[PDB]
Structures are given as C-alpha cells and as structure tokens.
C-alpha cells in the first residue's frame with residue numbers, strides 16, 4: 001500500500017544518510033517504486049519520455065510531465081488539494097533551475113508535513129512543515145498514487161548513524177528499543193526487500209526475533225549508503 005511506502009520513507013528521517021545518489025528525485029524514485037514495483041515506464045522504472053527531458057537530465061520541475069505516471073495508475077494535476085501520499089513538484093528558484101520534488105506525508109489543517117531530500121542542501125531525507133496556502137503557490141504538479149530475499153549470515157553490525165530502531169517485524173510498523181552510534185551486535189539472518197530495506201535479524205533475550213533496518217533497497221539492490229559496517 002501507500003501507507004507501507006510512506007512508513008518506509010518516514011523511517012529514513014534522521015538517518016542523516018542519502019537515499020540515492022542523494023538528490024531530491026532519488027527519494028521520489030524510491031517511493032514510487034515501492035508503490036509500483038512492477039512498472040516498466042516511469043520515474044521508478046527509470047524510463048521516461050525523451051520529449052523533455054533535455055540534455056538527458058531529469059529536472060524536478062518537469063517530473064509530472066516527463067514520466068508516464070498515468071500508465072501505472074497515478075493521476076497528475078496542476079490543481080490540489082494536497083493529500084497524504086502525493087508526490088509534488090515545485091518550480092525553479094533562485095539558483096535552482098530544475099526546481100524541487102517532495103512527498104506529502106500528512107495534511108493537518110493548513111499544515112503540510114513534507115518528506116524531502118536535498119533541501120538545503122542536506123543530501124539526506126528530512127521532515128519539514130509548510131503552510132498549504134503558501135506552498136501551493138510554487139506547486140507545478142500534484143501526483144496522486146493509486147517481495148523479499150533471505151539468507152543466513154553470522155555477522156556483526158557496527159552502527160554508524162545516530163540510532164536505529166529495533167523491531168519485532170521487518171517492516172516499519174512496534175519499537176522494542178534502539179541501537180546507538182558505535183554500538184555492535186551479532187545477527188544470523190539477512191532480509192533484502194526488493195523495494196524497502198535491508199534488515200539484519202537475530203534472536204533476542206526474550207527468545208524472539210528482533211529486526212533491524214540497515215539501509216534502503218531499490219529493485220533488490222542497496223539504494224543509498226548502509227547505516228553501519230559489517231564484519
């Protein structure tokens with residue numbers, strides 16, 4: 001679903017680690033793919049119209065028009081309203097000819113909750129808040145949306161981000177505890193989501209499997225740096 005995909009983006013917040021590539025569209029791309037993993041055309045699919053598209057570059061301001069969103073069930077519009085789950089493009093600004101692209105996480109009153117990457121710069125996912133009434137003045141398009149591979153490995157992960165949540169399931173929805181930067185722990189299992197996260201897993205004290213996310217995947221490969229080192 002769209003919620004499962006949104007949850008996966010929410011959980012990127014605070015990694016301080018780039019999804020991608022590291023640019024704004026890499027986050028959009030990854031999110032789209034989570035919703036349309038099997039699309040053949042589109043942003044996540046890596047295939048769009050060369051029609052424009054100029055110089056073989058992406059250009060965030062044109063993403064709504066440069067990819068065949070409709071082919072995969074997405075609607076595209078220059079009119080709102082905002083709603084959770086949309087991908088939203090924004091016009092060019094001072095020193096940014098290509099503009100910007102973001103993800104709407106939530107709509108509460110006039111508050112937009114926006115997930116985005118390379119706003120700053122700050123080449124990693126950030127949550128920010130904006131006013132709808134003010135934000136809509138820069139919106140180009142509103143883009144509205146409609147397994148896993150596993151093995152044993154007995155390794156040790158050393159955390160290289162501020163903290164990672166410990167979960168009872170390898171999806172991003174009940175947090176047992178966290179691991180902080182520098183800490184270490186052993187695992188016996190690896191799970192590679194085709195479109196999601198790499199998880200390592202182990203048996204905790206209580207007798208039950210804990211799960212730990214360790215970085216984003218796209219199309220079954222890592223899609224950004226890892227949240228730690230492995231030995």
Ligand SMILES: C[C@H](N)C(=O)N[C@H](CCC(=O)O)C(N)=O
Nearest residue numbers: 011012013014015163164165213
């Ligand atoms: C622990 C910290 N508050 C946090 O939110 N970390 C997330 C991981 C949460 C998760 O993957 O479920 C991260 N490194 O982005």
Ligand SMILES: [Cl-]
Nearest residue numbers: 049050051052
């Ligand atoms: Cl074309």
Ligand SMILES: [Cl-]
Nearest residue numbers: 041049068071
């Ligand atoms: Cl097409």
